[PDB]
Structure formats: C-alpha cells, structure tokens
Amino acid sequence: STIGKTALGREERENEKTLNDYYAALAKKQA
Amino acid sequence: ESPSLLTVIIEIAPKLWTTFDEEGNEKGSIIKVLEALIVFLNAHLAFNSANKVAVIAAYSQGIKYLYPESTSDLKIINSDMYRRFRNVDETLVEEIYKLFELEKKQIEQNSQRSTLAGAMSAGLTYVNRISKESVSLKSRLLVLTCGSGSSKDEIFQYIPIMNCIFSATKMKCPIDVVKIGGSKESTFLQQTTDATNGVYLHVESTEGLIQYLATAMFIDPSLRPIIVKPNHGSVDFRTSCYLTGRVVAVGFICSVCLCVLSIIPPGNKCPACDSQFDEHVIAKLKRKPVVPR
Amino acid sequence: DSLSKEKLLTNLKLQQSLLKGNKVLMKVFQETVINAGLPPSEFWSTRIPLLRAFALSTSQKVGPYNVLSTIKPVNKVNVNLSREKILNIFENYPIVKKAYTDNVPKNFKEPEFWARFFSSKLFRKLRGEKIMQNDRGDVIIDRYLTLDQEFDRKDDDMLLHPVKKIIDLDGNIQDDPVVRGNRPDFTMQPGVDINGNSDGTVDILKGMNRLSEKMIMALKNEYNDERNELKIDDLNESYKTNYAIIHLKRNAHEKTTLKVSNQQMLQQLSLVMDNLINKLDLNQVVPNNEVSNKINKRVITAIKINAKQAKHNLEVKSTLPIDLLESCRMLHTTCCEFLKHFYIHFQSGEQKQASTVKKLYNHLKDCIEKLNELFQDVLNGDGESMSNTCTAYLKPVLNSITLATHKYDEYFNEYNN
Amino acid sequence: SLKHSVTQYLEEIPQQVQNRLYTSPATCLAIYRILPPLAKFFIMAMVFNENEVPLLDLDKWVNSNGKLQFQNAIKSMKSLHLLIPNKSSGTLMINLNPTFKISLRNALTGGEVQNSFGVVVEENVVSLDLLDEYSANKWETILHFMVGTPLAKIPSEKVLNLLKHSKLMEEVNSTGEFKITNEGFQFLLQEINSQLWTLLLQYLKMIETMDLVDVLHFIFMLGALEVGKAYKILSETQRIMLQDMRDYGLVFQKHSIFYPTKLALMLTSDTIPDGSLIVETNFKIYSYSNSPLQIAVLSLFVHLKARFVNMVLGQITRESIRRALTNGITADQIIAYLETHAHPQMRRLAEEKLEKKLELDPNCKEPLQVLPPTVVDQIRLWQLELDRVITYEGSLYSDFETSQEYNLLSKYAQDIGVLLWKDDKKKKFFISKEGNSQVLDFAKR
Amino acid sequence: MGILDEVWKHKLILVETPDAQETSLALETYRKACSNGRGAILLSVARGKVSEGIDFDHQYGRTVLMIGIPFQYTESRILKARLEFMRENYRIRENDFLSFDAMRHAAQCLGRVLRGKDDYGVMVLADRRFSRKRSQLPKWIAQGLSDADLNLSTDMAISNTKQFLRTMAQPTDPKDQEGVSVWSYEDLIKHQNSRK
Amino acid sequence: ASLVASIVEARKKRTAKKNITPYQRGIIRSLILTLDCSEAMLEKDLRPNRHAMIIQYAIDFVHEFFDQNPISQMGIIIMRNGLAQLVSQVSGNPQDHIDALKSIRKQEPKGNPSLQNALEMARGLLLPVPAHCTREVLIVFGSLSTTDPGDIHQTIDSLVSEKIRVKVLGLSAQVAICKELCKATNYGDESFYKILLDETHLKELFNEAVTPLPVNKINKGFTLVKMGFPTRIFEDTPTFCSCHSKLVYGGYFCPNCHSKVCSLPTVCPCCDLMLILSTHLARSYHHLMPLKTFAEVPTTEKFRSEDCFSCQSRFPILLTSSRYRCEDCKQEFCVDCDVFIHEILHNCPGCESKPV
Ligand SMILES: [Zn+2]
Ligand SMILES: [Zn+2]
Ligand SMILES: [Zn+2]
Ligand SMILES: [Zn+2]
Ligand SMILES: [Zn+2]
C-alpha cells in the first residue's frame, strides 16, 4: 500500500600421487 | 510466565516413620514433614494465582487423593489466615486425619509391598487430565518418601518407575524426589530425577525442611532451563543382574526378553522367558582371549 | 559374485577407486597404512559396507525399454541423443550395433552415422512404423534391411518353444482337423490391397509383439504348476498366523553390594493422631537460624559444583595452535585405528590370529612411544605452556592403549607361564 | 503492560512509604505476585531463613543462558526496596526487608494477620443473579457515558470528576459536551484488567490529603477477597473509599456488609467471540455482537444502518471516519480495533491467500492481513485529507541589516528547535509562537 | 498419431495375430509381464481365438476395454440369408438377432476376468450404442451396471475406476462375508433347515 | 440413536483392542527404508505432491522409530531413474537419517522405479547384521509398474532365503508382484501389503511400522548378546572422541576399553561392544508384558465409586456407563485415562497400588 510515499511525476594432489606410487609398488610386489 | 501444576506424592506409612523415629531421637517427625509440606503448598499457591495443587498419599494399603477431595470440618489451622491457603490446607489435614484413622484400623493387616509406584502413576494420570481440560498448563511431580524403614525388595518397583520416566519425558513433567531416611541414595528415584530434568535431594534430619523445600524444590517449570539444579549425586543408569543381584557394567542380555545377566545362566537357558540358547553360540562367549602360543 | 567379503577385500581396483574420491577416508589411509605400517587387508576388513556400497552404485543397470519410440525427431529438426540412449539402442537392437562397429572408424564419423540412421528406413522399420516407398531413406543403411529380415527369422526361433496346453491356441484350431465351413469375411482377415498382397500392417503388429517378447526373455538371463492356478483360492481355509508367545516370569534377588512390631506402629500412630487433633502450629516450621545457615551452605556447596559443570556442558573452541591441533587429531585417529584392530583380533577366540595380535600389540606399544615423543617435543618447543593442555587432549586414548597392553600382558602371563 | 503499569506506580513511591506499605500481609501477598518469576524464586528462598546471603550465591543459581533475566529480576526487586543491599567485611551482602519478611511469613504460615484479608459474615448472596448483574451494569454505565452514547442514568460526580480530570473524555463548558480522545479509544481498546487499572491508578493520583498506603491496603486486599461471599466491616479512610469504589462496579452493597464482585477478583491476576465483525470491500460492517457497549464504540467511526438481535450491520463512510478523527482517534487504532475484532471467516480466507502466495513463491513471507487493504488505505488517505492544510502560529523575521545577523538569529532558532522556515536569499525566517520570546531575548543580547 | 508411444512407457504391447502359435507366445509373454510387475496390454479381437476360452483373471485381467459392439459384417450373403431364414421360421427379427449375436460376444469377453469372489476388475463398454443394451447383458452383469454408468465420458470413467481400484485394495472384513457370501459346513446346514 | 451410534462405533473400535496376547517381538531391529522417487510421484493426489508428503512423513517415522526402538538401526534407499540410490548407511544415529531425508526433499523425482534394484541393494545392506536382529525392508511404493533388469522372482527367493521381511505401502492400487513379495516373505501372511485411501490413513500406516514385528515360531535365533553400560563422566577440559575424532567436553566411558563415545546407544568404535543405558532396554518392556485391555461395565451392576480411581474425574451419568475396569485389580477407570494408560503409560495404577 503506497500511501506515504512521495507522489509520482517527472595439498590433495600430493596425497593422491603418493597413493598412486604406493599402489604401483603393491601391484609390482604381488606380481 | 505460565501457571504450573504441582502434584506432591507423599509416602506416609506406619512402618516407614516408626523406624525413622527409633533410629534417631526425633519423635513424631511426620508432623514436622506435614506442617512443612503445608507451608510449601501455600508457597506454591502464592507464586501465581492460576496454579493448582494435588497431594496423593500412598498409605500402607493403597493410594488416596488428599487434595482435591472427592465429592463423596475440624479446626486444626486458625481461620484467620488467607482464604485460598486455608481452603487447601484444612482439607489436606482432614484427609490426613481420616487416613491415619483408616490405617490404624488395619494395623494388623499384612502390607508387604510399598505403593509408591502406583501413586506416581496416578499423579501422571492427573497431570494428563489437568493439562487436557484447561486450554495451557505446566506440571511437576514431587515425591516425599521416607527411606529410613528398611525395604523388602525394590526390584518390582523398577518396571513401573521406569515406565513413569518415559511418560514424564513425553509431557515435560520434571519429577523431583526428596528422601528423609538412612540410605543416602535411592538408585531408582535418583535415575527418575536425572532422566526427567528433576531435582533429587536427601536430608537426614526432618527439622528445617522448609529451607530445603523453598530453595531446592521450588523451581517452577517456567524457569527450569535457566536454573542449575543443586543435585550432588551422580547416577550411572545401570541395572542389577537377574540371578546374582549385583550391578553389571558389562554383561549379557537375552535378545528375546532383554533381561540382564552378569554370568552365563546355569543350564544354558534364560531364567525369565525359558528360552533355550544355542550351545554353539554361547560357547563363543566362553572363549578366552587370544594370546600367542 | 563380486559383492562378497572376500572379493571386495581383493578387488584392489575398487579399493583404489573409492579411496581416490573420498578424502576423509584417504586422510586415515595415508597416516595408518603408508607411514604407520598397518596392512592393507586389515584396513578394509572393518570397512566392508563402505566397499560394497561404492560397488553397488556402478554395478546396476536400468531395465529394458522401447528406446526408439522415445526418440521424437521434433526446415531443420533437432533431435537430442545421450550416451545412455546410444548404449540402449545398441542393446535393444543388435543390427544397429553391427552397422555401427564396422563403419565408425572406417568411412565416416559417428555424427554422420546417426544422422544417416534416423533418415534411413531402418530406423522407421525398427520403430514399428510402416515404411513408405516415397521416402528416399539412406543408401548405406538400407543394405542391412535384408540382413534384418534374417535376424527376425533367427529371433522368431529364439522365442518359439512348446506352450502349455492351458493357453495353447494352436490346439484349439487343430482340435478338429477336418472342419470345413464358410471362409470368414474380409473383416476377419488381414488387410490386403487391390493386387491381393499384404498391406503390411501385420508386420508392425509382429514387430511390437517381438519387441515385448525379447524384452521379457532378456529378463530371464543367466544372472503341478497348472493345478495351483486353476484352484479357487477364496474357497480355501484362511491363513492362520503361527507367532510364538512368551510368558515373562518375574523374580530376582535384591541388589547386593530395628524391626518394629505392630504395637510400636500403633502407638506412634496414636501419638501423631493425638498431636494432630489437639493442635497444629505452622509457624513452628521456620528454622532456628542455627540450621538455616548450615542448610544454605550445604545447598550452595552443590550449586557451585553443578554451575562449574553447566557452563561448559562443530567441535568446541580450542586453545592450541592449528598446526599442533591437527597433528594431535592425526595421532588420535591412528592410535584408535590400531586399538580397533587389536581388539577385533584379541577377542576373536581363534588362536590362528595370534601373530596378528602380536603385530598390533607392537603397534600399540609404538603408539605409546609416539605419544610420549609428541609430549616431549611440545614440552621443549612450547615450554610446558601447551604440554599440559596437550596431555589432557590425548589422555583418554593413552589410558586406553596402555590398558590394552596391560590386559595383553596379564593374559600372557597366566597363559604362557 | 498490566504488571508493568502497576509496578511502575509502585516504584515512584518514596522509600519511607514503601516500608509502611508492607505492614499488612494482604498487600505483601499481592506485590509478591507481580515480580518476575526469578524475583519470586529468590524472595521465597530468603523469606524462611533469618540470615544474610551474599549476592554471588544468588548469581550461582542462574545458568549461563538465563544470565540476562538475573539483571531485570534484581533491578525490579531493588527498585521497590524489598531487597536491602548491606555491604560489610568487604562483601556486598544482601538481605530481605524485615517488614516484608514477617508479613510474608505470617501469610504463608497462618500467623496473626490483623484481619488483612478481612472477615466473613457467612451470609452469602447469589453471584450470578446479582453480583454479575450489578457490576456489569455499573461498569456498563461508566463505559456508555464514556463512549458518548445517550444513556438515562448518568454516573455520580465522583467518577465523572475523575473522568474529566484524567486525559480520558476531554470536556469544555463552551462546547457543553464531552468527547473521547486519543487515549480514550486506547482505553476502550484495553482488556478489562487494564481498563480497571487505569481508573484505579488515576484515582490514586487524584486524591489529596486519606493516606496513599490505605488506598493500596484496600485495592490489593480487595484482590484477596473471593466473590460470592460476605465480609463484615477497617480504616476510616477505607469507608469513604469503599463507597467511592462502589461507583466503579467493584463492590456491591445492599445499603454493614460489602460484597466484592467479578471485577474485584479480575484485578489481582489474569482471568464465536462477541464483538467479531466482518468488513467487506464495499466498506460495509457486520458485527456479530449483542451488547450496547460494543455497538456504542462502533458508532464512534461507523454509520450504523440497522440492528438485529444477533448482529449489527452498518457502513463505513467518510463522515464517520472524519467524526472519529476530529475527536483525536488515530487511524492506526481504528485498524487495530478492526483487526483484533475480526471474524474467523476473514482470518481463514486471509490464511488461504497467504498460502497461495507462498505456494507460488515461498521466498518472501507477506504479512497476514485479515481485512482487505483497500479499507486501510482509504482510512489513511482520509487522515491525510485532514492533514492537508498545515498552519503554525508564529512570527516572521525580516529586514536584517547584515547576513551575519540573519544567520545568527536563524541558526539559534534552529538550535533550540523553534525554526519552521527560512530563506537565505530573502534573509527571512519564521519561528513558532512558542519560541518567540527566546529569539527576541537572544536578539537583544 | 503417436498414441502407442505413450502406452509403451507404462505397459508392454502384445497383439493377437492370425498365426495361432505366435498368439500363444504373445499370451505367454503377456502373462509373464503381468506377474513380474512390468505391466502389459493385450490387444485382441472379440470374436477371435483369445475370446473363446482364455481367461484373464486376477492380475492377468484388471480392466476390460470393449472397443465397440462386436457386430458381424452386415453386408455378408451368408448372414443375410441366415437372418431371413430365422425371421420366417422362428419369427426372430433381424435387428434382434444381430444385437443378440453382438452382445453374446461382448458379455463373453466380460466374464473372463473373475474367477472367485476375491477377484475384481473394471468392465468398460466403449460405444454409444451400448447404452441401451443393459437389459441385454447377463443378469449378474446387468445388476452391477448402475444407472449413472449407462452413458459416461472418458474422464468420468477414469475417476470412477481410480476410486474403485483404491477401494478394492483394502483388507476385506471377514464378518461382512462370513455367512452371506461364503458358507462353511455349519452355514450350509442352516440353509437346509430354514428352507425345509 | 445418533449418540448411541457413537457408542456402538466406540464398542466396535474396542472390539479389535480386546484381543491382546503377549506375542514374542523382535526388539533389536534393522530396518531398510526404501522410498519411491519416480515420475509417478509427481502427481497431486497428495498435497502438495506425493514426493513432498512422503519425505515429511519419513522424517516423522524416523523420529518415532528411534524413539521407541533405541537399540535398533536404520538405512535409507531411494529409487530414481531405474536405479537404487543409497542415501544413508545402517546406523543407530537418528540425526544422520533426518539430514539425509532433508537433502532428498529438494531434488525433483524423475525416472522409473526398480523394485529389483532396491531389493538387491537392501539385501546387501543387511548382510553385516547379526543373526539375532530382525532384517526388515519398508518400501513406500507409488508406481503401478516395475522396470527391472533381471528376474524379480529370483530376488524374492533370495530374500526369503536370507530371512528378510518386506512391508510395502502402495499409493494407488494393488500391484501383483508387490503382493507376492509381501506374502512369500511373511510366511504366507497377506496383511503386510497396505494401500492407503487418504492422507490421514497414511500417517497411521507409518505409525504402525514403528512397533516391532512378532516373530515366527519356527524361526529360532535365540542368543545372548554382550552389552555394556558405560558411566557418564564430567570432565573439566575437552578430550578427543573415539568415534568422530573431535573435541567434546564429556562422553560415556566404555567399560571394556575405556574409550569415550559422544552419544548412546552405539557400538564402541574400538571393542565392537554395544553401549546402552538401562533406560534404552526399559523403553521396550511394554512390548513384552502388554497391559490387558479394559472392558466396559454393563449398567445392570452397581458401580464402586463415583470418581475415577487414578484421576479423580467424576463419571458422567448421561444410557452407556462411562466406566472401564481393570480385571487384575477391578478398579473403574474413566474413558480418558484408559487411552492414556494404554498408549503413554504402560502400568495400570490400580495394580501397582494393591499390596500383596
Ligand atoms: Zn530371556
Ligand atoms: Zn564423537
Ligand atoms: Zn569399548
Ligand atoms: Zn480417569
Ligand atoms: Zn489394574
């Protein structure tokens, strides 16, 4: 209701790598 | 902020208070508790004008509603006091007079089991009624028990009391307990206070009881969250074994019936539901720890 | 199959898969397996449900459905395809895969292939739509039209099998082989054209029939009765429950760590009765001021204790620096993991795992030394300012570890010597 | 505002009078109930022990969450001087008022009370037939005469004198009539409890030379009394006061014994609807009320058209709203009356409108307006129509020798808040009549 | 039109074909899809092989959609000769026999959906000419056909079907059928006593 | 008659309540809650839509389930795009499941439902569950069709082989396979496939599943389970929790390895021993000694007292006596108490007061 208004108008990457190397070592060990 | 109902459960029995008087040097201490309670109830009616009061006494042979009296008078207190205070006190004392007369008549009667559990259940039913009727009221249970008299067996009180805790936890009804007697702790009522946001107090001497009632058990439900309770004991929420009667920290419970056992039951059969356990499975429990050979 | 405890512990590819994505699990694995030395097979023994949950996510497939019917082409018209739909089209239609595998890398790219497929009459025939001679279609795909006529024949035999006599419609028409009546009207026969040959609507009826049959048969992959169906179930006896009852007897001994006669009870009740009838003084209730102070002191004594607890009843804010705190959490987690494995093997009850218990006992002993070394390192580094605060944060785990070693030694003493 | 209003009055009274006000337990039992819940908790603790408790002990009881409440409770308790702070031996010790303490102990434990609660004649009357009728009619007469509706039996000069002397119901001999004011409609908008406290509070301030404590020994004691029973007759001032109280429908007298009434118990503590009305977009009103009080107050800003036994139907018009505004009734109060006396049907439809608004877009929570916004907007617009022309009484200052002087005088008027308009180009400014003399005096100096 | 595409999403489409063995395979598949919850729809001819002995009870039939009255081909020399023969000999009017022939097939298909009294299904006769053939239906079918269902619309039939299917999924009260629709030995003896 | 109509309906409602036998119930449960989130769940027969209401009632069910089954555990699965999606592992923490359900509440349901995928996933989740637990699957189904990759009948046989039990709540009508699943799995009982008829009946159906299921007589798995009752400690300085490795002030100490745990009831993270409080067992005693129903008293006989035994509410005089009595103690009760004595309380106040 417009009454009062004015009117209008005009790091993880390192952790991942050491894991990948670790698993690579594993698979080598198993084989 | 809001009116609150106080439902006092008083455990008056000839055997309970007699032992209390003999073990001590105070005679007729029940009168001291009675007059202390009368002032306590008057104090509750003065906190606000819209709060009611209920007293349920558990006598030797059952329970009775001291206040309000059933629809079905002597002068013990001066008639010059406040009208509302007297209207609740005179009836309270009159029903005490009748109850003692009735209890005295059956003095020879063999009352072996206490009736505290039934009184607490009755109070909870009254709390449910009062809240349902008016519409917007709080509630609170106060249990005044005399623990001096040696009890026979409290095991039967466990199941009823434990059922009151859950119901009291549903309706937000803090149940406080006051114990006047020898043993410092009551394992079941202490758990009742802790599990329902209540206050537990134990006092050896009957005299000066109003001080404890006014300062400790006067916290209305409206200001429970802001007041720290003065309870000093610590409960462990443990239960006693079923055939050895000792508190168990680690043990065995039957899956079918959920009965605790400190040791493997003799005969490899549960002593509560008569359910036979698999010999292979129990053998698993008997195994000793693994150590290198 | 590959959803059991054994293979999930041996499927190293799966173990490395969920460990790559899950970071918190990766956090414990690095500390406990790489530097600590805990065996891999032991680490996954307590996390079987995690492995199985991650395996079931990628190992399930949607059911068969009519895929080419969902393809609405909707002058240029754009139709959207997805990898899942492409696989579905291949699964439900082996001819499309046959024409796909031999042409994608050889002659033209996949975008052209599928553009040709939808324009071809093959897509129209497979969609259960009557082929129009006017439609040009695609030259390349049309070569497989005759091949499909051979695959349909091979599929009709893949579905043909003897039918139960209950619903065998062939035996009804062969019931009397010499029946000669009046040939049925053209309304009871398949439609034909002026030249007398089939109009082709029966072919699409068979096509959808075959599609439904193949879908149902695909359900029954590698992964007496008549009597029951004919019986009237409603006329049989109602099902009766066979639930067992239990009657709980209640009797147990009381908890284990002056007798007043009726005359004394009667005398006291007379005394209180006399004391009550005569008079009752409420004003006497007030204490004597020598007990009120004692009572207040006793009450405040417990209030202080409760208030002490109640002020400190998302981890709570801590005082230690972040670097030290994180190093403490790592040491707590690794120590607890060893504790878990030690008890799993210690309480197994089979003596074949004695060596594993010995290894885990050694790890726990090393954990005690590591905890002491960390305390010493903080003590000298920070001058005991944080050492006392550091010793409290790891007190419960230290007590638990030493208790585990103590129990191991106590049972070792009695057992071995 | 109920407990706030009564408490606020009790704070301004000097300490020397508060000590005397606690001699009668009847009053103590009433003042005790008005304090915050924490205040009552601490008061009950100290009443039964004859010792002194350090403040830190009180602080220990409160939990960390409720620490804020402990500040209001202690402040309100100290304001009434119930709690006496005594500091000695390096500790700020805290004690309870001895007179308040003894009075409460007497009230709770049934000690000698000096008839603070009164006595009983044991000659009961019928509450429903007479007490309800007597005070309802007596309270009806004062409110009807307040609303301006014509009435046969006008109230006595006592309450009439009180009404005019209060801001309620301004009167003028030149006008020859009485009309309600801004606070008047607010008073009629207040519940029975506060509606009664306003008159009693005004009576307390009106009396002069009758003790102030005695007039409170009666009102608070009157709460202790229970309806439907007799009370034999007390202080000398309480006799004429009792008769004066009889004109407000608080106490019924047959002609030796006086009987409190429903309103008497309505003073101490708290405790389809009649008065609920429907307002349409057509600016119509249908009130589901059968009571001349509600009809009269509706007539303040409603053009009544007809009535039935069950309801009253009228129309909102510019004439009625202008009539109410001329009396000082603000449009905000009018809409408050309409909203708080709205029919359930309006509430249910408004709730459904809100639900649909939230159903399409739950991001924004529009306010729940029970009655249509057009009526509110039109009423406010009519208020603006009354506020169109603005006029002040004052003087125009001009013909200044120097810009410095014009700025000096005008700036001074701005500083003291009496400047209404200025123009630097013309070196002119206008100041209110209130600030004329100050500006003139400053000009000379 | 694309109507089949919408059907394919909810159920499998099995069609009766001139070949008997292929239709038998369609029946096998249709029953299989009904049992495993996949849902199936079977399009058949009212005067075909399926309607002359195959029963669709319990899950194999929960709704019957009779698309039009199964009239014969009127412009048939054999039928016209038979109609003339019946009219002169047995005084049967040609329209009466044609309606009787059509209804005996429509009812034939309707009754293949219930086996016991615990079986339920919806029978819809989709033709404006069915509205006046209620008296021509079997007595047990006509009694169940309400006066409001004589001429419905597709939406009004769907709404009723949804309500009916929901109602038939509730546990039946045994007492409601203990001795009025199902008889034990004791109930049968009573019926032999009162009658005599 | 209208008032009498209320009475007779009340008597009929009481008729079912009269039959109460102390059936053996499986207190230690392991439930797998399966929800349907497919295209068929976008309908508006349930306001605002099926998905919204089902999730809301699922949260309420989770609250109620763990309130009255403290030593049980739950897992949540949903069906989406013809696949079964896991959203909560089997656990005893009621807050984890509510959080998962709240997250599910946002995403729009789409795709086809697959009973086989959900059942297979539920079968795998209940594999690491002891033999003394009751393996249960509660499926909330809304579709009328099932698209499965394999043979559902084989899955049903596997479910029966593993002693899993299935309850299905359907939305619109009976599906043939669902009836078979609920029947072949419940030893031939056909009462475990329920189809609601309105919103209100759905709430009752969810509420009914909270109580434990009675066990079959031929399915014996009786055993003693090793439990532990820890002691709560109040510490001055925070300490690491052995379950989440985060600083908390106080926690219960396990009596077998002394490791602390944040909240109960849980299996200790170290010794794999279940830690519970005595109250958690007491919450289930009313399922083993159910309070025998109360029977109304005919007006022909004379009543004992004018007011209720436990609540002191005078019985109205009114046709139908407003009294219910407990046979064990023979104490009349008001109509209001009896509902509260058999649903909230579980001990008859009259029996307790009587001395022996
Ligand atoms: Zn047992
Ligand atoms: Zn934790
Ligand atoms: Zn442990
Ligand atoms: Zn009752
Ligand atoms: Zn009983």
- Closest chain F C-alpha to B25 CA, distance in angstroms: 30
Question: Cα separation of F27 and F13, whole Å?
Answer: 27
Chain C CB contacts of D48 under 8 Å are: 285-287, 292
User: What are the residues whose beta carbons fall under 8 Å from the beta carbon of E43, sequence distance 6 or more?
Assistant: E13, E14, E15, E16
Omega before F265 cis (within 30°)?
yes
Q: Which of F228, F289, F349 sits opposite B249 (nearest CB)?
A: F228
* Interchain contact B112–F (C-beta under 8 A): yes
* Interchain contact B183–C (C-beta under 8 A): no
SS3 content of chain C, % helix, strand, coil (to 5): 65, 0, 35
Examine residue B238 and state whether it is found in any structural domain, yes or no.
Answer: no
Residue of F73, F216, F242 for testing the chain C interface, max C β-carbons within 10 Å: F242
Beta strands in D233-298 (DSSP E): 251-253, 257-260, 277-279, 284-287
Residue of B211, B227, B263, B282 for testing the chain C interface, max C β-carbons within 10 Å: B211
Token pair of B288 as six digits: 């000793």
Examine residue B274 and state whether it is found in any structural domain, yes or no.
Answer: no
Q: Give yes or no for a contact between F226 and C347, defined as CB atoms under 8 angstroms apart.
A: no
Distance D127 CA to ligand 2 centre (A): 65
Question: Cα separation of F311 and F271, whole Å?
Answer: 49
Residue of B82, B83, B138 for testing the chain D interface, max D β-carbons within 10 Å: B82
Please answer yes or no on whether B81 and D268 come within 8 Å at the CB atom. no
The backbone region for E138, taken as left when phi is positive above 0, alpha when psi lies in -120 to 50, beta otherwise, is: beta
Instruction: Identify the residue whose tokens are 């790219």.
Output: C109
* Interchain contact A30–D (C-beta under 8 A): no
Please answer yes or no on whether B239 and F311 come within 8 Å at the CB atom. no
Question: Cα separation of B177 and F155, whole Å?
Answer: 57
From the CB of residue F253, how many other CB atoms can be counted at a distance below 10 Å?
A: 20
Distance F294 CA to ligand 5 centre (A): 9
Omega before D362 cis (within 30°)?
no
Of C371, C372, C360, C373, the closest CA to residue C404 belongs to: C360
Experimental structure resolution, Å: 2.9
What domains are defined for chain E? 1-176 (3.40.50.300)
Give the CA angle between residues D171, D174, D177 to the nearest 5°.
40
DSSP string, E9-31: HHSEEEE--SSHHHHHHHHHHHH
Neighbours of ion ligand 3 (CB under 5 A): F 254, 256-257, 268, 270-271
Distance D233 CA to ligand 2 centre (A): 72
Residue of D48, D57, D266, D269 for testing the chain B interface, max B β-carbons within 10 Å: D48
Examine residue B39 and state whether it is found in any structural domain, yes or no.
Answer: yes
Distance B190 CA to ligand 4 centre (A): 28
Number of H-type helices and E-type strands within chain A:
1, 0
Question: Cα separation of C196 and C179, whole Å?
Answer: 25
From the CB of residue F278, how many other CB atoms can be counted at a distance below 10 Å?
A: 21
Q: Give CA separation, D253 vs C3, D135, D152, D213, D242, in Å.
A: 93, 11, 22, 24, 10
Q: Give yes or no for a contact between D223 and D268, defined as CB atoms under 8 angstroms apart.
A: yes
Phi then psi for residue E137, to 5 deg, are -70, 160
Across the A:D interface, residue pairs with CB atoms under 8 Å apart total: 8
Examine residue B247 and state whether it is found in any structural domain, yes or no.
Answer: no
Give the number of the ligand closest to the Cα of residue F330: 5
Q: Give yes or no for a contact between F329 and F294, defined as CB atoms under 8 angstroms apart.
A: no
Sign of the alpha-carbon torsion through B227, B230, B236, B239: negative
Please answer yes or no on whether F177 and E170 come within 8 Å at the CB atom. no
Please answer yes or no on whether D109 and C283 come within 8 Å at the CB atom. yes
Examine residue B74 and state whether it is found in any structural domain, yes or no.
Answer: yes
Chains that touch D (3 or more CB pairs under 8 A): A, B, C
Q: Give CA separation, F148 vs D273, F113, F118, F162, F170, in Å.
A: 61, 8, 10, 21, 18
- Closest chain C C-alpha to F332 CA, distance in angstroms: 26
Coil vs helix vs strand at E104:
helix
Distance F72 CA to ligand 3 centre (A): 19
Q: At what angle do helices B29-47 and B83-105 cross, to 10 degrees?
A: 150
For every residue of chain B, which 3-state class applies, written as one string? CCCEEEEEEEECCHHHHHHHHHHCCCCCHHHHHHHHHHHHHHHHHHHCCCCCEEEEEEECCEEEEEECCCCCCCCCCCCCCCHHHHHHHHHHHHHHHHHHHHHHHCCCCCCCCCCHHHHHHHHHHHHHHHHHHCCCCEEEEEEEECCCCCCCCCHHHHHHHHHHHHHHHHCCCCEEEEEECCCCCCHHHHHHHHHCCCCEEEECCCCCHHHHHHHCCCCCHHHCCCECCCCCCCCCCCCECCCCCCECCEEEEECCCCCEECCCCHHHECCCCCCECCHHHHHHHHCCCCCCC
Question: Cα separation of C94 and C151, whole Å?
Answer: 9
User: What are the residues whose beta carbons fall under 8 Å from the beta carbon of C354, sequence distance 6 or more?
Assistant: B290, B291, B292, B293
Coil vs helix vs strand at D370:
coil
Chain C CB contacts of F127 under 8 Å are: 52
Burial of D360 (0-12, 13-18, 19+ CB in 10 A): exposed
Q: Which of A15, A26, A27 sits opposite C26 (nearest CB)?
A: A15
Sign of the alpha-carbon torsion through C189, C190, C196, C197: negative
Distance E176 CA to ligand 4 centre (A): 35
Examine residue B175 and state whether it is found in any structural domain, yes or no.
Answer: yes
- Closest chain D C-alpha to B242 CA, distance in angstroms: 41
Q: Give yes or no for a contact between D158 and D206, defined as CB atoms under 8 angstroms apart.
A: no
Q: Which of B23, B230, B246 sits opposite C302 (nearest CB)?
A: B230
Examine residue B49 and state whether it is found in any structural domain, yes or no.
Answer: yes
- Closest chain A C-alpha to C57 CA, distance in angstroms: 23
Chains that touch C (3 or more CB pairs under 8 A): A, B, D, E, F
CATH number at residue B101: 3.40.50.410
Q: B120: domain range?
A: 4-217
In single-letter form, the type of residue at position C223 comes to Y
Chain C CB contacts of A16 under 8 Å are: 20, 26
Residues in C 237-266 with any Cβ partner in B closer than 8 A: 246-250, 252-256, 258, 260, 262, 264-266
Phi then psi for residue E125, to 5 deg, are -105, 105
Q: Give yes or no for a contact between D180 and D299, defined as CB atoms under 8 angstroms apart.
A: no
CA E169 to chain centre: 20
What is chain E's length?
Answer: 196
Tell me how many domains chain B contains.
1
Residues in B 6-25 with any Cβ partner in C closer than 8 A: 14-15, 17-19, 21-23
Q: Which of B115, B119, B255 sits opposite F132 (nearest CB)?
A: B255
Question: Cα separation of B208 and F275, whole Å?
Answer: 43
Chain F CB contacts of B165 under 8 Å are: 279, 282
Examine residue B112 and state whether it is found in any structural domain, yes or no.
Answer: yes
Helix (H) or strand (E) holding C5: helix C5-10
From the CB of residue B202, how many other CB atoms can be counted at a distance below 10 Å?
A: 21
Nearest CA in chain F to B281: F223
Distance C308 CA to ligand 2 centre (A): 23
Coil vs helix vs strand at D198:
helix
DSSP, res D368? -
Please answer yes or no on whether C307 and D53 come within 8 Å at the CB atom. no
CA B265 to chain centre: 33
Chain B CB contacts of F229 under 8 Å are: 236-239, 248-251
DSSP, res C284? G
CA atoms within 13 A on the CB side of D318: 6
In single-letter form, the type of residue at position F45 comes to D
Question: Cα separation of C160 and C162, whole Å?
Answer: 7
Question: Cα separation of F77 and F86, whole Å?
Answer: 5
Please answer yes or no on whether C296 and D61 come within 8 Å at the CB atom. no
